[PDB]
Amino acid sequence: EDELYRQSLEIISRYLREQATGAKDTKPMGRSGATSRKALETLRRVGDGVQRNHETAFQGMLRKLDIKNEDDVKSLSRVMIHVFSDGVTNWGRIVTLISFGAFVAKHLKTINQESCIEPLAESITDVLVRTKRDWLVKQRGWDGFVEFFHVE
Numbered sequence: 572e573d574e575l576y577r578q579s580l581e582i583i584s585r586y587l588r589e590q591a592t593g594a595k596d597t598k599p600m601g602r603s604g605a606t607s608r609k610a611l612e613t614l615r616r617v618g619d620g621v622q623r624n625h626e627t628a629f630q631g632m633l634r635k636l637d638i639k640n641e642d643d644v645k646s647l648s649r650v651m652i653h654v655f656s657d658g659v660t661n662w663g664r665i666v667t668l669i670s671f672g673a674f675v676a677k678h679l680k681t682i683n684q685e686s687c688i689e690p691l692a693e694s695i696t697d698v699l700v701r702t703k704r705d706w707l708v709k710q711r712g713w714d715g716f717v718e719f720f721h722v723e
């Protein structure tokens with residue numbers, strides 16, 4: 572019914588949850604599982620590097636957002652639209668979107684608000700898919716993501 576949304580949510584939710592808890596989800600992927608698995612391998616390799624390369628800026632933005640509760644987490648959609656959607660789209664910026672999401676997910680675990688991680692992943696997915704579908708489709712979706720970051 573909306574295959575790109577469903578697959579995006581699975582990849583994003585899995586990465587954020589795994590980043591927060593330190594444990595891999597053992598459940599099978601849904602449809603397009605082969606691609607989703609490679610997308611997840613790519614985020615672990617690339618997204619983890621991004622959180623370190625931008626550590627000071629990431630810690631700074633986190634502090635500025637001052638996330639304490641569910642209402643603070645709900646406020647993030649507006650900021651993501653402002654910063655991510657209102658700019659050039661490329662894979663790098665999409666990785667920063669998702670990687671900073673993981674950064675926030677880990678924060679939510681530290682403040683014992685782990686229940687907000689899946690809603691956060693839904694919000695990120697809404698921003699990504701619902702504001703950049705045209706670009707994502709043209710760039711071959713998650714297959715394109717995997718191809719873009721491929722290690723020979």
Ligand SMILES: C[C@@H]1CC/C=C/[C@H](O)[C@@H]2CC[C@H]2CN2C[C@@]3(CCCc4cc(Cl)ccc43)COc3ccc(cc32)C(=O)NS1(=O)=O
Nearest residue numbers: 625628629632647650651654655663664667668671672675
């Ligand atoms: C060179 C650039 C990366 C480094 C920039 C870091 C910035 O200082 C802040 C640290 C977090 C980033 C702001 N923001 C983080 C935002 C905006 C802040 C709220 C938020 C919340 C969640 Cl859950 C996820 C993302 C975000 C929106 O997503 C992006 C996407 C691309 C770039 C920036 C960005 C963004 O600017 N990406 S980029 O690759 O062009």
